[PDB]
Structures are given as C-alpha cells and as structure tokens.
C-alpha cells in the first residue's frame, strides 16, 4: 500500500504545517502537525477541558463505531518548546492520504498547555519519530508509520515541505518526479529515538564550505534551524545590522538587509537554503526588527534541522531494518 497527503503551512511564515487525517468511523477529519521529532498521535477531543479548546476541531470517540478505550492507558508529553498535553487513549482507524491503519493508538487530550489552545489551526500531533519515545503507559504504543510499515510497498515515508506553499507527505514510495539530481543517503542513530544524523559541514552564502561534523535531528515539528553557536555566529556576521537579542531570545536583523543562503552538507552532497527561507518577519507588528530563522542550539542540548532546513530538500525517512535518511535538492 501507499498513501499521499498534502501538507499546508498554518500561516504566512510557515510556522508549522498541517495535514488532514481521517479518524474513526464515520471519518472525523482533523488537521494534524506531522512531527518527526516525537512519537505520540494525540488530538483535541470531546474530553479536552472546555476552557482549553478555542477553535480546534475535536475527535469525539463516542461517535466512532470503531473506537475502543485502551483501558488503563494514559499519556503525558512535554515538548522542547515548553508546551505539553496529557490524557487517555483509544484505538481507532486512522487514514492518511488513502493509507489506512486499524487499531492505531489515538491519544485523547484531557489537558493541553496554553500554546496549543492559542493555535486554532492545529488539532493535534502525529508523531513520526521512533516508537521508543511514545509516552503511553503502561503499554507503549506504536506510531502510525510503525503500524503501517509492513503493509507499505517500501518501508519509507518522505517529507516535501513547501516554502510559503503546500507540500507533500508520502508513505510507502519515493516520487522520483519530486526532486532534482540524486538522493544522498546518510546514517541514522536511533539511540535517542530521533531521526539523528551527522551533517558534513556548512557554507554561508558564496563562502567556502567548512568541513565539520554536525550531529542533529531531522525534525518536521520544529520551525527553525538550530545549530551550534559558532556556526550561527558565522552566518549572522554576514548580515549587516544583525545581532543576538537576549530580550527577544535570538538573532534579529533589519528587514532592509539581504540574507545570504545557508548550505549544509549531506555526505559529499549539498543542500542550499535560500536566504529568503531564513526570514521570519517582524518581531512584533510594525517593527523594523525581523526574527532570524537560524538560531543557536546552545542550551537545547541537540542540534535541530527543522522546517527551515528540511523545506529546502526532498527528505526520505527510510525505516528499513537499519534506518537511514535521504536528502535531495528540488
């Protein structure tokens, strides 16, 4: 089998991407944030504290004839950005772009933190990291991809995120029309449960390429590109007027400035992030100070190849017995 779904930016900045997901019988369609940095499929629901729901579409398990309570099961998650949620668990039928899993753990939120409530466009998350990070207790549950894997034509999914535009998640096949050149595959460590890999280096604009190993994760659920402070300093030094602002919480720059591209290494291959991808607009409405899309990972404890980087590439998440990542230009 295969599946293919369009993923759509939630706003004009590509702060995140939502993908429609069918849950239950009859189908309840929710717009979920596909997140290769986590491993829980959780949704706003009829069980979510009323005051914490503000415009989201909810899953109502009582209206699904295929929903079954996973008795005794609870979940609770906290994300790198400080947000969180928790609740109980049902199993139900879940379909993504024509690909159907029966008996998928659907984690129903009883509580969500403010940032989720405040974002009316995201109805939940669909985790695509490794199932070892799944938070369901006492019995850990598998991700949608893990459950679908054996049935797929090939045990892979691909992320093709758009710049200020929709893109595509495919399951079970590689669309050879979606990228230019060849796909370069690179080793993955699953030891922290992430799609973790090592970039071979970087370049700033037309500058010479610096060969240096950068360990990080391919994370569709993170907006920006978070890299070591040295790398990030080298980038923003090439932007007139840029500075790191402790009050704002990272690098900012005047919108009158021209942003250089940023290139990262995949083996001997090279992915170029155009400068425009690194602009995240005014820090506040009307401000001439713009927020940068490349920021320091210092104090996160891991480097994160988030949407800023991934949307410059066609990315293969290869779930073969030994997982790998593939990157192509497009």
Per-residue burial over 113-138, b if 16 or more Cβ lie within 10 Å, else e, is beebbebebbbbbbbbbbbebbbbee
- Give CA–CA dist 160/117, Å, rounded: 27
The sign of the CA dihedral 40, 278, 281, 292 is: positive
For the record, the structure tokens of 283 come out as 């820090």
Are the C-beta atoms of 172 and 2 separated by less than 8 Å?
yes
The owner of tokens 């398990």 is 61
Residue of 237, 242, 252 lying closest to 287 (CA atoms): 252
Question: How many residues does the structure list for the chain?
Answer: 330
Catalytic, 35? Answer: yes
Q: Which residues pair with 272 in a beta bridge?
A: 263
The residue from 85, 95, 199, 296 that is catalytic is 199
Per-residue burial over 43-76, b if 16 or more Cβ lie within 10 Å, else e, is bbbebbeeebbeebbbbebeebebbeebeebebe
Inter-CA distances, 67 with 28, 35, 75, 85, 314, Å: 12, 23, 17, 21, 35
The sign of the CA dihedral 283, 289, 292, 297 is: negative
Largest CA distance in the chain: 60
CATH number for the domain formed by residue range(s) 5-174: 2.40.70.10
For the record, the structure tokens of 158 come out as 């691909």
CB atoms within 10 A of CB 235: 25
The sign of the CA dihedral 220, 221, 224, 228 is: negative
For the record, the structure tokens of 302 come out as 């891991």
- Give CA–CA dist 242/233, Å, rounded: 10
Catalytic, 92? Answer: no
Q: Domain limits of the chain?
A: 5-174, 175-330
SS (H, E, C) the chain: CCEEEEEEECCCCCCCEEEEEEECCCCEEEEEEEECCCCCEEECECCCCHHHCCCCCCECHHHCCCCEEEEEEEEEEECCCCCEEEEEEEEEEEEECCEEEEEEEEEEEEEECHHHHCCCCCCEEEECCCHHHCCCECCCCCCHHHHHHHHCCCCEEEEECCCCCCEEEEECCCCCCCCCCCCEEEECECCCCCCEEEEEEEEECCCCCEEEEEEEEECCCCCCEEECHHHHHHHHCCCCCCEEECCCCEEEEECCCCCCCEEEEECCEEEEECHHHHEEEECCCCCCEEEECEEECCCCCCEEECHHHHCCCEEEEECCCCCEEEEECC
Which is it for strands 225-227 and 303-305: parallel, antiparallel or unpaired? antiparallel
CATH number for the domain formed by residue range(s) 175-330: 2.40.70.10
The residue from 14, 35, 146, 160 that is catalytic is 35
Are the C-beta atoms of 50 and 111 separated by less than 8 Å?
no
- Give CA–CA dist 151/128, Å, rounded: 17
How would you classify residue 64: left for phi > 0, otherwise alpha for psi between -120 and 50, otherwise beta?
beta
Are the C-beta atoms of 114 and 49 separated by less than 8 Å?
no
Q: Which residues pair with 218 in a beta bridge?
A: 305
Are the C-beta atoms of 116 and 83 separated by less than 8 Å?
yes
CB atoms within 10 A of CB 24: 22
Strands of the 196-204 sheet, one edge to the other: 269-273, 262-266, 196-204, 210-218, 303-305, 225-227, 294-296
Q: Which residues pair with 45 in a beta bridge?
A: 59
For the record, the structure tokens of 113 come out as 């933190």
Same fold, 5-174 and 175-330: yes
CB atoms within 10 A of CB 98: 12
Q: Is 222 exposed, middle or buried (0-12, 13-18, 19+ CB in 10 A)?
A: buried
- Give CA–CA dist 174/179, Å, rounded: 10
Q: Is 210 exposed, middle or buried (0-12, 13-18, 19+ CB in 10 A)?
A: middle
Residue of 33, 29, 51, 54 lying closest to 42 (CA atoms): 33
């Amino acid at each position: 089998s295969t599946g293919s779904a369009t993923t759509t930016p939630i706003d004009s900045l590509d702060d995140a991407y939502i993908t429609p997901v069918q849950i239950g019988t009859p189908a309840q369609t929710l717009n979920l944030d596909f997140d290769t940095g986590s491993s829980d499929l959780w949704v706003f629901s009829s069980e979510t504290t009323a005051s914490e729901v503000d415009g989201q579409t909810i899953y109502t398990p009582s209206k699904s004839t295929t929903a079954k309570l996973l008795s005794g099961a609870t979940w609770s998650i906290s994300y790198g950005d400080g947000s969180s949620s928790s609740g109980d668990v049902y199993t139900d039928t879940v379909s993504v772009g024509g690909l159907t899993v029966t008996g998928q753990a659907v984690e129903s939120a009883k509580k969500v933190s403010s940032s989720f409530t405040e974002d009316s466009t995201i109805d939940g998350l669909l985790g695509l990291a490794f199932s070892t990070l799944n938070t369901v207790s006492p019995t850990q549950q598998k991700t949608f991809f893990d459950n679908a894997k054996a049935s797929l034509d090939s045990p892979v999914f691909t992320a093709d995120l758009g710049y200020h535009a929709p893109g595509t998640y495919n399951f079970g096949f590689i669309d050879t029309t979606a990228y230019t050149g060849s796909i370069t595959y690179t080793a993955v460590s699953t030891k922290q449960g992430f799609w973790e890999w090592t970039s071979t280096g970087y370049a700033v604009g037309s500058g010479t390429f610096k060969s240096t190993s950068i360990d990080g994760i391919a994370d569709t659920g993170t907006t920006l590109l978070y890299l070591p402070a040295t790398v990030v300093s080298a980038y923003w030094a090439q932007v007139s007027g840029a500075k790191s602002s402790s009050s704002v919480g990272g690098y900012v720059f005047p919108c009158s400035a021209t942003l250089p591209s940023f290139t990262f290494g995949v083996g001997s291959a090279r992915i170029v992030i155009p400068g425009d991808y690194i602009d995240f607009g005014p820090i506040s409405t009307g401000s001439s100070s713009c927020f940068g899309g490349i920021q320091s990972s210092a104090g996160i404890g891991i480097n994160i190849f988030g949407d800023v980087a991934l949307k410059a590439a066609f990315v293969v998440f290869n779930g073969a017995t030994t997982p790998t990542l593939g990157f192509a230009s497009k």
